[PDB]
Design a binder for this molecule. Sequence first.
Ligand SMILES: C[C@]12CCc3c(ccc4cc(O)ccc34)[C@@H]1CCC2=O
Ligand SMILES: C[C@]12CCc3c(ccc4cc(O)ccc34)[C@@H]1CCC2=O
Lengths: 125, 125
Amino acid sequence: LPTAQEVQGLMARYIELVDVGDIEAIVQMYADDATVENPFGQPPIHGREQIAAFYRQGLGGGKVRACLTGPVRASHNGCGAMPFRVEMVWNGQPCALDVIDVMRFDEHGRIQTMQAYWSEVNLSV
Amino acid sequence: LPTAQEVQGLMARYIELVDVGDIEAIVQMYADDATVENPFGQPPIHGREQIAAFYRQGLGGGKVRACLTGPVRASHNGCGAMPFRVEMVWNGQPCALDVIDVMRFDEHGRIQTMQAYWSEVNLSV
Ligand SMILES: C[C@]12CCc3c(ccc4cc(O)ccc34)[C@@H]1CCC2=O
Ligand SMILES: C[C@]12CCc3c(ccc4cc(O)ccc34)[C@@H]1CCC2=O
């Protein structure tokens, strides 16, 4: 599994790919069996093709940015958690969404699970 | 089952109790049979007594301080995640540890599970 240090690097790489909106590069970070819950509380999405659709719908339209708002917390079992802020425009309203993602990596360094904690209370104009 | 706003309030209250070292009130925020994984990656501890013993050892003498370093992220299914910083002593000097806790609350508003994401990569001097 990725070490704690490697998890910090991988999760920051993920943020960079979201921030520039490189949909195909994001998808390659995920394993073929990856399970994403985004937002946590909803039915998951499974596998690269379905995960690609999330990012294309979310990032492929208007300009979206993402940046870490604190350090990546990494564990000794290939897992980590990070706080970040997504900026977007929602029907003319400039918005920010505060999110925490929790990720578990597999032994090939790919994302096997991700949970994105956020809801509407985390949105602001 | 706490709404997203209620989760934000409960998790913020937890931080205040840690900051003032109110171990009895912290324990009462947990369900009687809750689990804590702290750090995430270690075996869960189970039940209010083990959880109490954990907070007594970690907080019992001061001068631990704790504060949120960003907003509480909350779901619609009674869960949340928060970034915070703990200030304590390591090797006789003041240190800081960045942590993310993920909590799931029961239908009585008590913490059923807590997972604390951090490792030594999050410890600074
Ligand atoms: C999809 C989205 C843009 C990107 C995004 C959102 C929410 C959680 C995310 C979590 C991620 O790990 C990466 C991107 C998002 C926004 C919710 C509404 C929206 O437009
Ligand atoms: C115990 C501790 C202070 C409190 C604390 C730590 C780590 C994770 C925590 C998670 C919490 O939800 C509440 C408190 C802590 C530190 C690890 C070493 C130390 O001094």
